[PDB]
Amino acid sequence: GGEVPIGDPKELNGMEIAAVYLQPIEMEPRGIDLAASLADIHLEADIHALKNNPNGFPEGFWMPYLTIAYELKNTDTGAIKRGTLMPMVADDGPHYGANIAMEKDKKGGFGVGNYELTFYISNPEKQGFGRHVDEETGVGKWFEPFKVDYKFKYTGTPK
């Protein structure tokens, strides 16, 4: 396989937010995500700090402890599935990801076609990650929860 971009990256809320997919990945620990042989893609959100990030993250750093829900809709068939992307690390660094059955899903029409993808992103405080707020070392308030949308044509597992 290879790494396929999904729509255009957004710059929002002090972050660059891109979506990509690749071949299904084998992940440890076993059992917390869909096994590679049962999936058709690995969906990733690639989210890093912009310059002048208002929450203290240096430019280029991965944004950790985000809650990222996704909804994937085939607009041709109407099929919809949702889940949460989980934090993990690959050889090129940390990301948020999930293995997803597409052609292999028999409970809907998740075959080749036109898709709408939405990420629903909540800030790190939802997971109990802290921020300094004192004058001397403090940072700005976190963004409120938000959505980003992408449209893309799915043409099959990277093969």
Interaction of residue 86 with a copy of itself, rule CB under 8 A: yes
Tell me how far, at minimum, the Cβ of 108 lies from a copy of itself, in Å.
25
> Which residues 110-149 are close enough to bind a copy of itself by CB under 8 A?
124-125, 128-134, 136-139
Tell me how far, at minimum, the Cβ of 22 lies from a copy of itself, in Å.
8
C-beta closer to a copy of itself: residue 73 or 95: 95
Which residue is at the shortest CB distance from Cu ion?
A: 97
Interaction of residue 22 with a copy of itself, rule CB under 8 A: yes
Question: Which CB contacts under 8 angstroms, 24+ apart, belong to 69-73?
Answer: 69/119, 69/120, 70/43, 70/45, 70/98, 70/117, 70/118, 70/119, 70/120, 71/117, 71/118, 71/120, 72/43, 72/100, 72/110, 72/115, 72/116, 72/117, 73/115, 73/116, 73/117, 73/118
